[PDB]
Structure 1
């Protein structure tokens, strides 16, 4: 089988393989070709679209024949230069498909689906350094013979064990013609099953799949996947054991490479877009079981909502995200709620605040030096990229986050540094914040400074602050937990919404695709009032905190 399948494909390939659409044949292939030789990238793509028209069997049997169709179609491929003498100087290639109709979960990437065709969706996690182990080559026994061009290749250590005199490795062999080797390129990384898709009781899945050369340095831990024999010596002969064979059997085996309802929901969103009171129509649907603090929710509502400036001063592209705090009593004083409230949303990451060993966001490679505790993941912060981070207990950030957020806020990145290793990352997401003060509400007369009980250069950085002061207001408080019991009143009650806690998530889906920009006028009232804001604040008015 191995030979015909190795060959019969090429014919079905090659005729397919001269770029077809927009007239046909040689012209479109040459664009792909001339695009290839000139930067010396050696990479292409083969859309699954045209193939299943041409031959879906190819489009299928790939999955059914991937693992020996490769090294021949691989080899026939390489005369794109239009010259066979310039192909063996080439080192390797990497290609891709287009528009496989499927992907699968990791739990759906099963034993009965190992190795197969991979549409590649998930979570970059726990990266590594990157190495070109050897595909093919020799170390052939110097005492008796020279090159045989096959050893290492699979994840393995040495290869060749068929038919000595020295050719099989029932004989010494180690020196490698290092000038002659397919050291290729890759790292191993522990791609997680995205919890943001997952049904609560889940426990995610850190798939140790590789980013080889073309897949390389394009991602960061938390992020997208967009990728003749011998002798008749048969089984059962004395001396053979499977423990030399199993460690891959212990592994991954695959790898990767680089509407009425719409309108109806839109209509209700349009109606909602027509809807006045929309904050209140929004608010309690998101903030059902808080009394007072209507301001505080009001921002946090908005804190959900983004909007970015690009770079046009050649600086950074400016902030759109928000960093605001709620300050006061002990979680019961529900800042917990808000952290919990937000969870009724995805793109949403949730700490145990800070008092949490959970050493992630002190990133480090997990096989530094024999196997390593600190993991390449600031999912403490990173993992909410273009989401939001929600942190209680922020005062317990003692060190490792302490400076960390400062730049990270400021720069949306994590400059990793090890002095044998070093990196920087990207975290474009918001920071929802709340932390208790020194021991309680004392800020009525004490300065925020040290009443916040945190460091100026971040409290300064926080986009806003807010408060949840506790008070025994019997004028209200008779009614207050009157709610809460009525919130404890499960047996016969359901919490009234303005509307779904989904459509909102689709509103804010609908909301941020729209964009905004101010008129030639609107700046004035910014200015005249920012003035006036500073003006009263600059004139000696009764101050709460010198910020301005």
Structure 2
């Protein structure tokens, strides 16, 4: 008995358009109408606490019958105007509810659970262009029968088998119901499960998620949203077709839509934040395998800290990423073990250098009726969003890597363009790289040309530079190996873990809406002093890179 529930849900939603809170009247309704119509943004939300207090069974009815409430809420909701005047002006739009408080893991979302909803969580993989593919319509000739208001619905073609006209293949026909049709869109997005919530050997299963036009690019792609009879014919008439069953029936079909608790957290975290000189503690703990080079380890440690200024005065895009150049080994017994240290950090994605399948940069049409080998994803940086970028085999920048990396460095996005695709992104994360020379730093007597063994357009944009001269000093090398073996002596020497050091990072999360408004008097004093810094460089100090 769908009719009574279909009517009463619409009734209990429509009478709810006026709030008892926020004064009284249509002021809030007017604000909602203004926010909906004038910018055409189509964003609305309903408080679930009030919904449950009014009729908690309502959330259950929608939960168990989204498939039933979608089509009726499509048309009847249009009645927010309460006037026939504005109903022809708007053609179509969609709004929904947000902040659903109950979620399930994607992998466990079994077909036995059709009708629920979950958060759109993961990374976009294998993006798809927008098309208004077949939704509903009719193939039959108008002279034989008229168009019916109940046909197809799903991707299957016409169900009725009356007027056996098109059964013969010796006839071409093109009468398309282009005047009256519901053609909009549906797109496949291969959302991948969150790796952090996933164990080591995962191989996630990507669902078949369908996103509406309003859902198209409504957020940053690749990220989580974290804010009688005739003819004497008897029964038994055969003639079924099996061509339309193996396509959709074999996949998952659903639709998608886009306080003491704070105080308790504030108490424990903020007080322990008051501890001074925590960074000094990190150097020994976070870098167990370093001897000397206190300035070298310092730059990396500071690189961990974030904070990038945005554009609020409507000016130019300030670059806020960090590009550090380290002078080190002659590329023999690589100190690249320091990369492994970077692995000890949560809430980040670990780039595996550059030796990979490299699905990007050779993107092609992804509609070969089942799939395409290459996907639309420049994971070379995109995957590294909101984490750390680690590039190994940096000597692999001959042709293909050179073009990609500079463009990413320059614009902080990738503009892949294959005559069918063109878009820009925002990849806000650090880039950590180190390049080794052929055999060492010897420009004192040898020409710098062809010596430094780097590429100009990439080395130039690097933020930091260092001078590291290695000498055969037996005094310090002797005790180097003592610390190395210490890593295996956890039994008698281990640093006790009293508190998590990761809380500091979540402090910067709130920093985005807060304004620091650093005083100008403290700022310029360094700037004026910086003049002396550049002048002494040209007086004959040892040269390593003419950037300054």
Change (3 A) 1:442 1:192: farther
Which deviations, in whole Å up to 9, do the C-alpha atoms of 1:41-60 show, x marking residues without a partner?
A: 66643333321111121111
| Equivalent residues of 2:331, 2:439 under 8 A apart | no
The SS at the match of 1:210 is strand
Change (3 A) 1:276 1:100: closer
Q: Distance in 2 between matches of 1:173 and 1:146?
A: 16
The SS at the match of 1:416 is coil
Q: Distance in 2 between matches of 1:278 and 1:235?
A: 85
Q: Which moved more, 1:370-379 or 1:315-324?
A: 370-379
Q: Distance in 2 between matches of 1:196 and 1:309?
A: 28
Q: Which moved more, 1:471-480 or 1:187-196?
A: 471-480
In the TM superposition, what is the alpha-carbon distance from 1:414 to its structure 2 partner?
Answer: 0.9
Change (3 A) 1:472 1:230: farther
Change (3 A) 1:260 1:39: closer
Q: Distance in 1 between matches of 2:19 and 2:295?
A: 60
Change (3 A) 1:15 1:525: closer
| Equivalent residues of 1:327, 1:436 under 8 A apart | yes
In the TM superposition, what is the alpha-carbon distance from 1:324 to its structure 2 partner?
Answer: 0.9
In the TM superposition, what is the alpha-carbon distance from 1:96 to its structure 2 partner?
Answer: 1.8
Which deviations, in whole Å up to 9, do the C-alpha atoms of 1:17-68 show, x marking residues without a partner?
A: 4455324565533432354344556664333332111112111111101111
Q: Distance in 1 between matches of 2:300 and 2:389?
A: 13
| Equivalent residues of 2:138, 2:158 under 8 A apart | no
Q: Distance in 2 between matches of 1:428 and 1:390?
A: 14
In the TM superposition, what is the alpha-carbon distance from 1:366 to its structure 2 partner?
Answer: 3.4
In the TM superposition, what is the alpha-carbon distance from 1:322 to its structure 2 partner?
Answer: 0.9
| Equivalent residues of 2:125, 2:192 under 8 A apart | yes
Change (3 A) 1:484 1:125: same
| Equivalent residues of 1:220, 1:425 under 8 A apart | yes
Q: Which moved more, 1:288-297 or 1:219-228?
A: 219-228
| Equivalent residues of 2:309, 2:318 under 8 A apart | yes
Change (3 A) 1:215 1:413: same
Counterpart residue number, 1:126 = 126
Which deviations, in whole Å up to 9, do the C-alpha atoms of 1:142-179 show, x marking residues without a partner?
A: 45122223455424455655798999999997521212
Change (3 A) 1:510 1:499: farther
The SS at the match of 2:188 is strand
Q: Which moved more, 1:257-266 or 1:123-132?
A: 257-266
Q: Distance in 2 between matches of 1:6 and 1:232?
A: 43
Q: Distance in 2 between matches of 1:235 and 1:484?
A: 85
Structure whose residues are more often helix by fraction: 1
Q: Which moved more, 1:107-116 or 1:494-503?
A: 494-503
Structure whose residues are more often strand by fraction: 1
| Equivalent residues of 1:42, 1:92 under 8 A apart | no
Q: Distance in 2 between matches of 1:381 and 1:128?
A: 19
Q: Distance in 2 between matches of 1:203 and 1:368?
A: 23
| Equivalent residues of 1:348, 1:388 under 8 A apart | yes
Q: Which moved more, 1:231-240 or 1:100-109?
A: 231-240
Q: Distance in 2 between matches of 1:168 and 1:91?
A: 39
In the TM superposition, what is the alpha-carbon distance from 1:3 to its structure 2 partner?
Answer: 2.6
In the TM superposition, what is the alpha-carbon distance from 1:537 to its structure 2 partner?
Answer: 1.0
Q: Which moved more, 1:158-167 or 1:254-263?
A: 158-167
Give RMSD over aligned pairs. Answer: 4.4
Q: Which moved more, 1:270-279 or 1:384-393?
A: 270-279
Note the residue ranges of structure 1 that are not aligned, 5 or more in a row: none
In the TM superposition, what is the alpha-carbon distance from 1:464 to its structure 2 partner?
Answer: 1.0
Change (3 A) 1:102 1:82: same
In the TM superposition, what is the alpha-carbon distance from 1:542 to its structure 2 partner?
Answer: 2.7
| Equivalent residues of 1:416, 1:422 under 8 A apart | yes
Note the residue ranges of structure 2 that are not aligned, 5 or more in a row: none
Q: Distance in 1 between matches of 2:382 and 2:483?
A: 37
Which deviations, in whole Å up to 9, do the C-alpha atoms of 1:397-434 show, x marking residues without a partner?
A: 33333222223222211112113432222212211112
Q: Which moved more, 1:405-414 or 1:254-263?
A: 254-263
The SS at the match of 1:248 is coil
Change (3 A) 1:260 1:36: closer
Change (3 A) 1:441 1:547: closer
Which deviations, in whole Å up to 9, do the C-alpha atoms of 1:329-380 show, x marking residues without a partner?
A: 3888565333322222234333332233433365555337974333222222
The SS at the match of 2:273 is helix
Q: Distance in 2 between matches of 1:262 and 1:469?
A: 50
| Equivalent residues of 1:365, 1:372 under 8 A apart | yes
| Equivalent residues of 1:282, 1:498 under 8 A apart | no
Q: Distance in 1 between matches of 2:469 and 2:368?
A: 47
| Equivalent residues of 2:352, 2:390 under 8 A apart | no
| Equivalent residues of 1:190, 1:207 under 8 A apart | yes
Change (3 A) 1:168 1:81: farther
| Equivalent residues of 1:124, 1:222 under 8 A apart | yes
Counterpart residue number, 1:297 = 297
Q: Distance in 1 between matches of 2:23 and 2:119?
A: 30
Q: Distance in 2 between matches of 1:360 and 1:231?
A: 62
| Equivalent residues of 1:287, 1:341 under 8 A apart | yes
In the TM superposition, what is the alpha-carbon distance from 1:13 to its structure 2 partner?
Answer: 2.8
| Equivalent residues of 2:366, 2:375 under 8 A apart | yes
In the TM superposition, what is the alpha-carbon distance from 1:532 to its structure 2 partner?
Answer: 1.4
Change (3 A) 1:167 1:396: closer
| Equivalent residues of 2:359, 2:376 under 8 A apart | no
Q: Distance in 1 between matches of 2:353 and 2:518?
A: 37
Q: Which moved more, 1:425-434 or 1:100-109?
A: 100-109
TM-score by length of 1: 0.84
Q: Distance in 1 between matches of 2:16 and 2:225?
A: 28
Q: Which moved more, 1:350-359 or 1:318-327?
A: 350-359
